[PDB]
Design a protein around this ligand. Structure first.
Ligand SMILES: [Ca+2]
Ligand SMILES: [Zn+2]
Ligand SMILES: [Zn+2]
Length: 226
């Protein structure tokens, strides 16, 4: 029940005691493995070093919870939903321009279907970021629906956008309680609608930011300046 790179937790909750772990982060996806793999489990109070974020934490089965986890410099992505439910409870996720893993991209990667990623407990983003959550746009065996639930989160820094939903797959992002540093309408965009596709069967299309639509369930009242 120790927290170290390569660890897989299943049917239990693990308290890492606030320890720091990590491997490396070359700028290569061919070689970045997840630090922790979760299977109907929970991981808490864990720090991941700046030069060793690798491929983050994977929720490869069932319901998962990632509580009070700190990413000193997100490498490929922070956490990945390949299960039924992935809940992010608090924690801080830092990333930066000129950091490890290249230009900042996605924090939460969501690939499973008829699943839900949940962001609560005031999960915070620091530094420079790409997107908080993205429903895989061109995955192999892509489809939906994919759901995002944000009841509270803080972006103490910069970010390209918040959520990306695949309109043609029935994805729904429900956002509220979001605070963004220097927020202004469209700066940055919150919920954006896209057209998802199956890998090799076509290409993705961008529809842009939307408010209070079937797929983008966020009101202008749900996002505010930090
Ligand atoms: Ca990074
Ligand atoms: Zn990844
Ligand atoms: Zn995995």
């Amino acid at each position: 029940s120790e927290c170290k790179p390569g660890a897989t937790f299943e049917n239990r909750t693990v308290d890492c005691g606030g320890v720091t772990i990590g491997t490396s982060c070359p700028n290569d996806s061919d070689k970045q493995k997840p630090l922790i793999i979760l299977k109907n489990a929970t991981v808490k109070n864990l720090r991941i070093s700046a030069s060793g974020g690798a491929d983050g934490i994977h929720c490869d089965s069932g319901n998962c919870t990632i509580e009070n986890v700190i990413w000193e410099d997100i490498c490929e992505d922070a956490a990945t939903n390949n299960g039924k439910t992935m809940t992010i409870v608090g924690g801080i996720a830092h990333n930066a321009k000129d950091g490890y893993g290249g230009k900042p991209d996605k924090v939460l990667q969501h690939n499973s279907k008829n699943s839900t990623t949940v962001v609560k407990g005031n999960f915070t983003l620091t530094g420079e970021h790409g997107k908080l959550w993205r429903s895989c746009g061109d995955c192999s065996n892509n489809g939906g629906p994919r759901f995002l639930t944000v009841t509270s989160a803080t972006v103490n820094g910069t970010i390209d956008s918040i959520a990306g939903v695949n309109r043609n797959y029935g994805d729904v992002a429900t956002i509220s309680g979001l605070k963004i540093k220097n927020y202004k309408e469209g700066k940055p965009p919150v919920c954006e609608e896209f057209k998802g596709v199956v890998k090799g069967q076509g290409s993705t299309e961008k529809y842009g930011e939307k408010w209070d639509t079937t797929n983008c369930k966020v009101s202008r009242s749900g996002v505010s300046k930090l």
